[PDB]
């Protein structure tokens, strides 16, 4: 039923043919307008039928520059004015006639309009528009100090029919405007379907009603559910008496502005309660058991980026590159840190990398392909920059099947992959790193999985006996599975307990 509206004000394109066409597509067959109803400059030979089944407009109703004879809005009950035109007008009807033509607006077929929750009315400069001066507009408008402006309209209009009692939208006997406001008992806070104190509207009717119930409301102060007005849509989880907890309520329904629905529109996604366009800044789409839904990401939603090397512009992360990683969590492909990259090259004018910019990678948790470090900024003796890196897939390899390759990095002492736990596939190579220690104790049968036989290549790093002599060993609180460096934060897994990545005695 429901469908959205426009915000274009009084701007159009050159084609009045297009202006019609484009108008039709939007307000297709539509009961509720979520937005505004902007009928501007519309074609003179319009056949405005689709407009019939329109009951409500959450915003305002703008009718300007048009040429057609009558505005056919028969099911239109409520205009909310929750946003409003110019500033103070829920209905703005201005300048609907042409000079060279007799095509001009003569009637507003608003037979059904019952009330306007917020905003005034501007009915001016409509040379042939008729009967508007007869209507009681303070009967419709809910705001005691909204601007009701009606003038410079028709000149020679026929009198109302005798059945309309001098207040009518058109000459017809069915074109009579029916009164809404009787003023009211003190109990009913201006919300009643009759004078009496017992004749109060239900506490969920946005404006008036025709009875003291859910489904007698002219409009719903919160959500409409299949006819009834309710403060909420039926919740997703109902408390079960059998299991003493909550369970997936099959009578659940999602919000959509003010309508409880069975399933969100073809484009829209669920967010805890409402049907929304795009997930908020802390969620990503999750399809599970025939339902799409916004799930809170926690740390960060996976900002997955392009990697480097094979199938990418860069064979190395360089100074004109590093910026294109900010906030990045997952990485598609690889990451190569080559000699040039770091120091740049003055032949091809590509500057040297600012070593602090590397921190960018602290946000990273996963890398699809391989990681390849063949150079590192001397004053940093470890890759604590990838401390948060948890998984290396190895889905694309480097040299001869290498999913991880560290090589020829002199000043590097520890590794610093505190969070690394899985290298899914590929070979590993950590050789020729002349001051690297702590890696000897690491159990690569736990990090890597699948075969173990001929997948390791660790060699010509600082020999273990030196590392041990200088005290460089796995913190006592580590398990025999080893460590990424010194201290309690760097363990593979802990002997006792672990409080926020750091292994503890209690």
């Amino acid at each position: 039923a429901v469908c959205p509206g426009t915000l274009n004000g009084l701007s159009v394109t050159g084609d009045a043919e297009n202006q019609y066409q484009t108008l039709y597509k939007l307000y297709e067959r539509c009961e509720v307008v979520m937005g505004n109803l902007e009928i501007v400059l519309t074609g003179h030979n319009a056949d405005l039928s689709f407009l019939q089944w329109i009951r409500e407009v959450t915003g305002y109703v703008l009718v300007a520059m048009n040429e057609f004879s009558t505005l056919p809005l028969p099911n239109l009950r409520v205009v909310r004015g929750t946003q409003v035109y110019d500033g103070k007008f829920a209905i703005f009807v201005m300048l609907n006639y042409n000079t060279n033509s007799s095509h001009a607006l003569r009637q507003l077929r608003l037979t059904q309009l019952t009330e306007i929750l917020s905003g005034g009315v501007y009915i001016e400069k409509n040379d042939k528009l008729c009967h508007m001066d007869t209507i009681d507009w303070r009967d419709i408008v809910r705001d005691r100090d909204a601007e009701i402006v009606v003038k410079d309209n028709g000149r020679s209009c026929p009198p109302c029919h005798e059945v309309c009692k001098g207040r009518c939208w058109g000459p017809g006997s069915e074109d009579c405007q029916t009164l809404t406001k009787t003023i009211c008992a003190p109990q009913c806070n201006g919300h009643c379907f009759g004078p009496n104190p017992n004749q109060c509207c239900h506490d969920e009717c946005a404006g008036g009603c025709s009875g003291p119930q859910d489904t007698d409301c002219f409009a719903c102060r919160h959500f409409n559910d299949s006819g009834a007005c309710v403060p909420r849509c039926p919740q997703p989880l109902v408390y079960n008496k059998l299991t003493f907890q909550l369970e997936p309520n099959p009578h659940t329904k999602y919000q959509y502005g003010g309508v409880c629905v069975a399933s969100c529109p073809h484009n829209f996604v669920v967010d805890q309660t409402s049907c929304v366009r795009a997930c908020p800044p802390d969620k990503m789409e999750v399809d599970k058991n025939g339902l799409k839904m916004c799930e809170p990401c926690g740390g960060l939603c996976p900002k997955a980026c392009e990697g480097t090397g094979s199938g990418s512009r860069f064979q190395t992360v360089d100074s004109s590159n590093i910026d294109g990683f900010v906030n990045c969590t997952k990485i598609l492909g690889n990451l190569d840190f080559l000699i040039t990259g770091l120091n740049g090259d003055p032949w091809h004018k590509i500057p040297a990398l600012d070593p602090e910019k590397l921190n960018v990678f602290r946000t990273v948790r996963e890398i699809t392909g391989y990681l390849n470090i063949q150079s590192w900024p001397p004053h940093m003796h470890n890759f604590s920059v990838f401390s948060n890196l948890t998984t290396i897939g190895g889905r694309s390899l480097y040299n001869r099947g290498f999913s991880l390759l560290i090589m020829k990095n002199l000043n590097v002492t520890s590794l610093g992959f505190r969070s690394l736990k899985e290298i899914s596939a590929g070979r590993i190579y950590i050789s020729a790193n002349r001051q690297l220690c702590y890696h000897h104790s690491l159990n690569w049968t736990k990090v890597l999985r699948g075969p173990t036989e001929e997948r390791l290549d660790i060699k010509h790093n600082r020999p273990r006996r030196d590392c041990v002599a200088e005290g460089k060993v796995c913190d006592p609180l580590c398990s025999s599975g080893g460590c990424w460096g010194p201290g309690p934060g760097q363990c593979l897994s802990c002997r006792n307990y672990s409080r926020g990545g750091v292994c503890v005695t209690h």
Partner: antibody
Framework: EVQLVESGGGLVQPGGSLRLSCAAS????????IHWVRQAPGKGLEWLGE????????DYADSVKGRFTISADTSKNTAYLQMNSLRAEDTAVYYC??????????????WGQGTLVTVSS | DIQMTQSPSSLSASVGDRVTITCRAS??????VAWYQQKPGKAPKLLIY???FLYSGVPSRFSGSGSGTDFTLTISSLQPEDFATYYC?????????FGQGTKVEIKR
């Protein structure tokens, strides 16, 4: 099954230059470390150089560091010793030999048969 | 630069005898010493690694011992085919130095 084969050794003129071949067989160099050692026909062994096949790293014995250059070619599965500026004291049997798998050690577990380089005028 | 000193240079022994070779290193090598056997004109076969471990396909009579500065090879039951020159090797880091070697020959 796993074996090495060398070639190309022989007489050379002092200050001349030479390239030894060490053709691998029964395994993949890639990742494995190939070392070269030599031995004077009387005396014992001396280590010369080494080379990972993956990243192509190379170290050298100071007794040789610069005059010699150890390389390989991965697709071909063979290592190479380039022996420039040869002195008479270079006369020795040269073996290539790959490194052991079990342990961070450089124990060499498979060895070529040897190839002889005599360097005299 | 590391020294290996291997004692004695040559040695004779009867078949069945026990034989003990010694390498002494210039600097604490903890455990990174490899032992090899080299027969006349053949390439040297590896016998022991990490001072004390046997390699796959060496008879159990060959055994190695020691830590740090003093390392030892022992052929318990000497045989005729055990004739060789025997070489200890430091393998801790490069450049790998070897011993002078111990020439073994049998008594008959």
């Amino acid at each position: 099954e796993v074996q090495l084969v060398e070639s190309g050794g022989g007489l050379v003129q002092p200050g001349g230059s030479l390239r030894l071949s060490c053709a691998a067989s029964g395994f993949t160099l890639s990742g494995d470390w190939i070392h070269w050692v030599r031995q004077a026909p009387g005396k014992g062994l001396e280590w010369l150089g080494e080379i990972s096949a993956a990243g192509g790293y190379t170290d050298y014995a100071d007794s040789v560091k610069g005059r010699f250059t150890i390389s390989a070619d991965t697709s071909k599965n063979t290592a190479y010793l380039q022996m420039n500026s040869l002195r008479a004291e270079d006369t020795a049997v040269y073996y290539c030999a790959r490194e052991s798998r079990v342990s961070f050690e450089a124990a060499m577990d498979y060895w070529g048969q040897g190839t002889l380089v005599t360097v005299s005028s | 630069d590391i020294q290996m000193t291997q004692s004695p240079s040559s040695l004779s022994a009867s078949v069945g005898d026990r034989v003990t070779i010694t390498c002494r290193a210039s600097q604490d090598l903890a455990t990174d010493v490899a032992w090899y056997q080299q027969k006349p004109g053949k390439a040297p076969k590896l016998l022991i690694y990490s001072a004390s471990f046997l390699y796959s396909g060496v008879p159990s009579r060959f055994s190695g011992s020691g830590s740090g500065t003093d390392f030892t090879l022992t052929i318990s039951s000497l045989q005729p085919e055990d004739f060789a020159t025997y070489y200890c090797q430091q393998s801790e880091p490069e450049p790998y130095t070897f011993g002078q070697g111990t020439k073994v020959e049998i008594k008959r």
